[PDB]
Amino acid sequence: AIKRIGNHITKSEDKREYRGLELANGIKVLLISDPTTDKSSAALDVHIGSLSDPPNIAGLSHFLEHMLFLGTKKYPKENEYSQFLSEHAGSSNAFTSGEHTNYYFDVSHEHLEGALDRFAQFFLSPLFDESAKDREVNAVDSEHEKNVMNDAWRLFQLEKATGNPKHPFSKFGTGNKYTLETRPNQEGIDVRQELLKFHSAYYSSNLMAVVVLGRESLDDLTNLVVKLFSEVENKNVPLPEFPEHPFQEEHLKQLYKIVPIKDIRNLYVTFPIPDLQKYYKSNPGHYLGHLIGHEGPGSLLSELKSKGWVNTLVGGQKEGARGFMFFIINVDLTEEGLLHVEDIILHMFQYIQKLRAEGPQEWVFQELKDLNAVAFRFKDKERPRGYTSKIAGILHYYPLEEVLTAEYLLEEFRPDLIEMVLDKLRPENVRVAIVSKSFEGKTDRTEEWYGTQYKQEAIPDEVIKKWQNADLNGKFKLPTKNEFIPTNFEILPLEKEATPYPALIKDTAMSKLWFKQDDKFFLPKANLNFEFFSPFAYVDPLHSNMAYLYLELLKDSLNEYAYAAELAGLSYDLQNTIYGMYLSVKGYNDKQPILLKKIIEKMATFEIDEKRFEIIKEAYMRSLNNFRAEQPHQHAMYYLRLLMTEVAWTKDELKEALDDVTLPRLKAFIPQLLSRLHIEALLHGNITKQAALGIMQMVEDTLIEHAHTKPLLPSQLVRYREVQLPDRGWFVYQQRNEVHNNSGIEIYYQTDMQSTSENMFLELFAQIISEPAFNTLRTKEQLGYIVFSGPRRANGIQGLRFIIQSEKPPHYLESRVEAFLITMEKSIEDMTEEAFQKHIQALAIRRLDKPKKLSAESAKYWGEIISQQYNFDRDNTEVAYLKTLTKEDIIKFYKEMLAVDAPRRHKVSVHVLAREMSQAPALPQPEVIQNMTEFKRGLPLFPLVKPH
C-alpha cells in the first residue's frame, strides 16, 4: 500500500525537517528528518484500545500487544528485537489506552534498518510461544499487582466501573492472572486460538500511526519505508465509536462516598459531555479549563480559601471516548469542608451563575490566543522518547500539516460552543464523589477486583430544587486581564565575555552568585535557584516544623496572586532543605526583577491568619502519619539518607513535636530565623551580567531593608558529615511495615569520595552490574518486581546500593545477592575485548550528552552547586581517565572492597520486614542495632571535599 504525499509542515524555532503521509492500508506516517540528532526513533500507534475486547476476556488486546513483541518468522528467538536494542542502547516500550495501543522505540544512531526489519513483520507472523505466554502472564499479573493499591488507577477504574455494564466502556483494561489465563481454561477457551482470531480479525486493517524519527533525509527514508511497508494489508475495519455517554439516567445526578487507601479527602465533580473534537479550531474546553479553575480576585477558589474549606484544586476537561468526553472538578476538603459540602456545591453554582451572567468573553479569547500564539511559536525542541508517541496519540484526527498546530493554535471564536457547554453544565449533568476514610460500617457495595466499598444513595429533591433555582451571585467577580504578558522578545547578543562556564561575578560576605546565558538554545526564559541557608533549620524537630508550616502558609497566601504567573509560564517553588529553605523560580524574561522583588518583599514581611494557621497545622499533622504507609523501597531510601548523614530526625519524633506549636511562638521565631541567613544562587537565561548584579543587589538590599540581615562569618558555613564503617563490618537492621506483605532491602557500599579513579571505577562497575542483574535476578530468578541495582551518590560520596522489595526472607535474599556477586566475580574474567570496548563506549555515551532542555542542565549544575563541587569540566577529566583502565584493576577494585574476604570490607545492608513476620557460603554474623543513636555514638566521620 505504497503511497507518498508531502509538503511544507508548519513546524513553529526548530531545525528538524518534517513530512507526513499516509499509506493506503490505513497507516498514518510522519517523516522526521534531522541531520544533527544522535538517537533515531520510530513509534507505531494502533487506534484500537482495550475497550474493544470481547465481553468475556479482559485485557485481551493488552495481552496480545504484550505477546506481539516476541517471535517472528524471520527471527523466532524471544528477546531478539530487544537484545538488538540492547546492542545499540535502544529502549522500546508500549502502552495501551481505551482506543489506542502505542508501540515506541529508539535506536543508537543510524541502525534503524535493523529494528525496523525486526518490527515490520510483527503483522505477518505472530508465534505465541511457550515462554512468551508463560512469562508474560506473570508480567501482566505483576503489572496489575502494582496497580492494586495505586490510588490514581484505583479511583480511575472506579470511575470506569460505576457506569453502564452494557457500554463497552465497562471493560477491564489490564487484567490480572485470574481473568487472563485462569478465566479461559476454566471456561475451556483456548487463549492462543482467540489470540489468532483477534490478530486476524481486528488488527491488520487500518488506523495505524507510524512516525519515523530518522537522521538521514526525507526522501531516502521515504522510499525505504514506503517500500518496506506494503505487507500491511487493509481489511476495512470500521471506526469504533460510541453513540452515547455511558450514563443513561440510572447513574445521573448521583453521589458516592468513597474510602481511599491513603488517608486523603477529596470531592469529585464530573460531567459526561459530547465531543467537540471537530471544534479544535475554537476549542471551548481550553476556555472552560481556563475559566473554571482560575484563581483570582472574586474567583470561586478565592472564596473557598476565604472560607478555608478547600486547600487546592484541579478541574477541567477530561479526554474520553470518541463519542462522549468528560469534564471534571476535583477539590480538596477540610474538616467542615467535609461536613458542609452542599454549600460548596452552592458556591460552585454561584460561580456557574457568574458564568451565566457575563456569558462568553472575547478579550479572554484574544488573551489566551496570544498566549498560545507566542508559546506555540516559541517551542524549544522535543524529547526523542515520549513526544513522538504523544503526537502519534493525537495524530489520529489530523492531516499531515495539522500535526504540529494540533490544539496549540486556535483560529476562530465560537460563542455558540460556549452557549452549548453553558447549557450543558447544569445540575442535571453533575456526578458527585466524596472521598473520606471515616465511612466504615456504612458502605456496602464492594469493588470486585480491588475491594473498595461504596453506596449510591441518590440526592433527594429538596437539595435539587434548591440547587436549580438558587443560582445567584454573591461576591464573585470576573477574573481581571493579565498584565504579565511579555513584550520582551529581543535576543541579546553574546558579549566579549565568552566564558563557557559561570564565573563568580559577585562576592560578598553575604552571598555568592553564579550566572550563565544560553549561546545555543535562544529562548526568552530564565532560571533562578535561590537557596536560603540557616543554622536553625534542622537544629530540632520544633523549629523545622515551624519552617515547614511557615513555607506552607507562605505559598498558600501568595497563591491567588501566583496563578496568573503560573498560567503564563512563570513558575516558582518554595521548598525547605536540611540546609534552609529552597527557592526555584523558572520562566520567562518579562517581570523577572519585578516579580522577584515582590516575592522577596512578601516573604520578607509576612503575616499570619488564625484559622489559616489552624488549617495548616491540622492538615500537615494529618499528612504526618501517612508516612507509615508507603512502599518499603521509598521508606528504605528514607532510611538510607537517614543512616548516611550526620544528624537525622526521624518522622515520629518530628510528628510528636507539633503537639505544642502555637502561633505566637512561631511569630516570635520568624524574624529570628530571618535575622541572619545566606543565599547562593545560580541564574541562567536571557539577561545580562550587570543586570544580574543589580538583581542580586536588589535582593540583598530588600532583605536588609526588611529584617536587617547582616552577613555570615565563614565559620558557620557548615556541612554534615557521613558515617565511617569499621573497615571490615557488615551491619544491618530491620523495620516492619504494617500494610504491605513484602520485605524490602537496600544494600549500601562505601567505596570512596569522588576521586578521578573512583568515578570511572564505580561507573564502569555500575554498568556491568546493570544489565546482568536485571537479566538474572529479577528476570531469570524471578525474585521480585521492585528489584533495583546501582550507584548512590550523596554528600560528595560515592556509593553502591541495591533496592529490592519482595516477599522473601531477607537473609535468603542476601544469600542470592552474594550468589550474584560470585556470578559477577566469575563473569569478570570472562570478558573479551568486545564486551570491554562496547561496554566502555556505551558507558561513554551514557555519560556524555549535550543538554537539550535548558531546565535539565540547570538542574545538573545546581545539583553540583549544592554539593559544592563545581568541577564543570569533569567530563574531559572522566573521559581522559577512562582510556587508562584494565580489567585486572576491577579485580583490584573487587577484592579488598567488594569481596567477602576483604580486609577493607565496607558492607552494609538494611532490612525492612513484611507485615506478618543456588548455593551460599557462610558469611560472618551481623549485628543487632537497637539504638541508632547509640550506634552512631562512637563512630568516626568522613572528611569533606576540597571544592573545585
Short mmCIF file of N, CA, C and O in Angstrom, two decimals, residues 6 9 171 217 254 309 323 357 437 456 480 524 579 587 641 646 713 744 803 850 874 898 913:
data_model
loop_
_atom_site.label_atom_id
_atom_site.label_comp_id
_atom_site.label_asym_id
_atom_site.label_seq_id
_atom_site.Cartn_x
_atom_site.Cartn_y
_atom_site.Cartn_z
N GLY A 6 3.92 14.55 0.41
CA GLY A 6 4.37 15.55 1.37
C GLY A 6 4.55 16.94 0.82
O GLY A 6 4.65 17.17 -0.39
N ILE A 9 5.28 21.68 6.32
CA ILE A 9 4.60 21.39 7.58
C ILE A 9 4.88 22.60 8.45
O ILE A 9 6.03 23.03 8.57
N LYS A 171 -15.19 -2.37 30.15
CA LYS A 171 -14.20 -3.43 30.08
C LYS A 171 -13.12 -3.18 31.12
O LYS A 171 -12.89 -2.05 31.55
N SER A 217 17.54 11.93 5.77
CA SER A 217 16.94 12.96 4.92
C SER A 217 15.43 12.75 5.02
O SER A 217 14.95 12.07 5.94
N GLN A 254 -25.88 11.91 40.81
CA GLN A 254 -25.58 10.94 41.85
C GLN A 254 -24.33 11.27 42.62
O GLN A 254 -23.37 11.83 42.10
N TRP A 309 -12.25 26.19 53.16
CA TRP A 309 -12.76 24.84 53.09
C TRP A 309 -11.96 23.97 52.15
O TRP A 309 -11.91 22.74 52.33
N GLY A 323 -17.05 9.24 21.14
CA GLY A 323 -18.36 9.86 21.23
C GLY A 323 -18.48 10.87 22.35
O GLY A 323 -18.66 12.07 22.11
N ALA A 357 -24.00 35.02 33.82
CA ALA A 357 -24.27 36.45 33.67
C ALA A 357 -23.47 37.08 32.54
O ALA A 357 -24.04 37.58 31.57
N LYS A 437 -12.00 8.67 54.65
CA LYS A 437 -11.62 7.42 55.27
C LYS A 437 -12.65 6.93 56.29
O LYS A 437 -12.82 5.72 56.46
N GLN A 456 -24.81 4.15 46.73
CA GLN A 456 -25.42 5.06 45.77
C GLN A 456 -26.05 6.26 46.45
O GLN A 456 -25.48 7.36 46.42
N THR A 480 -9.69 39.44 36.33
CA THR A 480 -9.05 40.55 35.65
C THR A 480 -8.08 40.08 34.58
O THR A 480 -7.52 38.98 34.64
N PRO A 524 13.52 33.23 25.41
CA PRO A 524 13.34 34.33 26.36
C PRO A 524 12.93 33.88 27.76
O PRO A 524 11.94 34.34 28.32
N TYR A 579 19.41 22.28 54.86
CA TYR A 579 20.26 23.45 54.97
C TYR A 579 19.39 24.61 55.42
O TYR A 579 19.62 25.22 56.47
N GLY A 587 11.05 30.65 34.41
CA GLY A 587 10.06 31.07 33.46
C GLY A 587 10.64 32.10 32.53
O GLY A 587 11.84 32.16 32.33
N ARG A 641 19.08 7.70 53.50
CA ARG A 641 19.54 9.05 53.78
C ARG A 641 19.49 9.36 55.27
O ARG A 641 20.13 10.32 55.71
N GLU A 646 24.98 12.91 59.06
CA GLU A 646 25.49 13.26 60.37
C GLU A 646 24.37 13.29 61.41
O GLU A 646 24.37 12.50 62.35
N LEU A 713 29.63 34.94 58.98
CA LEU A 713 31.06 34.70 59.00
C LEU A 713 31.38 33.31 58.46
O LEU A 713 30.62 32.38 58.67
N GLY A 744 11.57 -5.31 52.06
CA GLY A 744 12.48 -4.55 51.24
C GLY A 744 13.89 -4.59 51.78
O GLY A 744 14.14 -5.00 52.93
N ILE A 803 18.23 -1.94 45.68
CA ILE A 803 16.93 -1.74 46.28
C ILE A 803 16.00 -2.85 45.82
O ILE A 803 15.67 -2.94 44.64
N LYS A 850 25.11 16.25 25.16
CA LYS A 850 24.94 17.67 25.40
C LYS A 850 23.48 17.92 25.77
O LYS A 850 22.59 17.24 25.26
N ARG A 874 34.62 18.15 34.58
CA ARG A 874 34.69 16.75 34.93
C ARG A 874 34.53 15.82 33.75
O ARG A 874 34.95 14.68 33.82
N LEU A 898 35.03 -5.24 47.68
CA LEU A 898 33.73 -5.84 47.44
C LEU A 898 33.64 -7.29 47.83
O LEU A 898 32.54 -7.75 48.12
N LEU A 913 11.02 -5.45 57.32
CA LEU A 913 10.27 -6.68 57.41
C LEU A 913 8.95 -6.58 56.64
O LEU A 913 8.50 -5.49 56.26
#
